[PDB]
Write a protein that binds this DNA or RNA. Sequence first.
RNA 1: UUUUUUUUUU
RNA 2: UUUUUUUUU
Lengths: 268, 270
Amino acid sequence: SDSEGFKANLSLLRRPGEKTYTQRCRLFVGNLPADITEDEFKRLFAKYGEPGEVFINKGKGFGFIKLESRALAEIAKAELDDTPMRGRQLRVRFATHAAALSVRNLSPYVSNELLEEAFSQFGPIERAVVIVDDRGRSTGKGIVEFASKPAARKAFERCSEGVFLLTTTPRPVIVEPLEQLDDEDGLPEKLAQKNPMYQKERETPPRFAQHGTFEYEYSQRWKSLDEMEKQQREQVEKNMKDAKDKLESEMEDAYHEHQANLLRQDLM
Amino acid sequence: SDSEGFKANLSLLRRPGEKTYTQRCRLFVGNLPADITEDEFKRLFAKYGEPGEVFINKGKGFGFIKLESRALAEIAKAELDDTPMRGRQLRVRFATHAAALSVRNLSPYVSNELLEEAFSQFGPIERAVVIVDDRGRSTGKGIVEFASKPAARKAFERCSEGVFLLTTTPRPVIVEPLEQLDDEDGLPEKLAQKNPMYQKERETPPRFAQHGTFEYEYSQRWKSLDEMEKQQREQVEKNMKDAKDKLESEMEDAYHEHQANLLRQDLMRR
RNA sequence: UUUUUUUUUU
RNA sequence: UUUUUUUUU
């Protein structure tokens, strides 16, 4: 099995200039009994270094706990999800950041730094990242993870009511909520059992479709629909880029055909 | 920075149930000499434990190297990016992942394990994952990091071209390439410099727009086009989901109404 | 052409 | 031959 850690380990597990006990560290353990104590929890993750921001709603059997690093936590979940524990089996996963903001239409020269500079005005930041492609050039979209949920909510309103921008040439930042998901651990078969009918569905083994069946043509149609679904979206995207890609330059006709007209009248 | 104890250390960075020297460990180092040796390259990541498959295109001043954990590479990349080295500053960042597939229209029953159980037939797989929401459930959307590009390629071919399915109730799997991006290290000002005009743009500082113009006005009109782009793509989705959502049932009538058709006809040879 | 800038193998 | 997992301050 996985060694639990060591004091050694703990500083290692700090992903390299990660701030400790980020919200990204907080973990939701659901499913705990009612008479679970404050220190009985905390004991469960004695294993995992000096705990932090810990909390329970005993009435619903659930609670939070921040650990040293996101790596460290992720092991926590690793080691703990589906622990039997007074009959119940604890369910651990990460807590829902919900302070997390996706941002788009960033110039290619927004640096991770500068994004935090900008948005640090709406409060304590936990992290601000500009995303990068396979060659590590900007992809116009970024992440701001906020300290407090007010801080986010205020950055949201402000930036989506008002017009926030970042560099000399003007591109409003478009601040939509980030929706979280896990591609790291995902869904194991472990806990894909304890749903209604794994078997009913999985009773037929992965396979290719018979070049004739109903079940083939059904698919080949559904596919077809989807290929189309794409074609449409792909066209909307193309329509609309073409649409921004035009604008900047016919905008510079509000300042170039509006004076081109008004010039020789006054001092003549 | 630059870590005090290792070896005793590395194993601990490995990940949980990470296959080590996965392609997600593969580092691109670009920007190096004519005259780098192989030896010299590996000696570079001496620090970082047993080196994996490594490779230099001396002809183009770049090479690759796999390290034990994604974890550990991350570090090397960090300790090493921009290292001056006979005239140049080497570039370390993660190499590209050809051999990474996105899958879709995934049964909500499809388990991480099962996913690779299926795909393993096109080649060894490095990992496969069902993505899950905040409430850890299927997003009908997976990932299958493969062995090699051939593997991912035959996997792709055989799934666009054929009709692969995974559970009993027929949902084709939609393999497409999955394109690669870094929500992690991202883009530091560090090297945000070394493009032509950082300043030109950064000259103006992060601000609101002037409730008059002009930058304001161009910006709310850009905002318009956008909310509109949304509306459109929002609809394409609801439209075509309707289309599909229909199909399950409106197909169950090529198989009952073309079949309760052909029973009564021959029932009159009198 | 000092270099950042191209370059991401079967 | 034991229990909140469409419940996340």
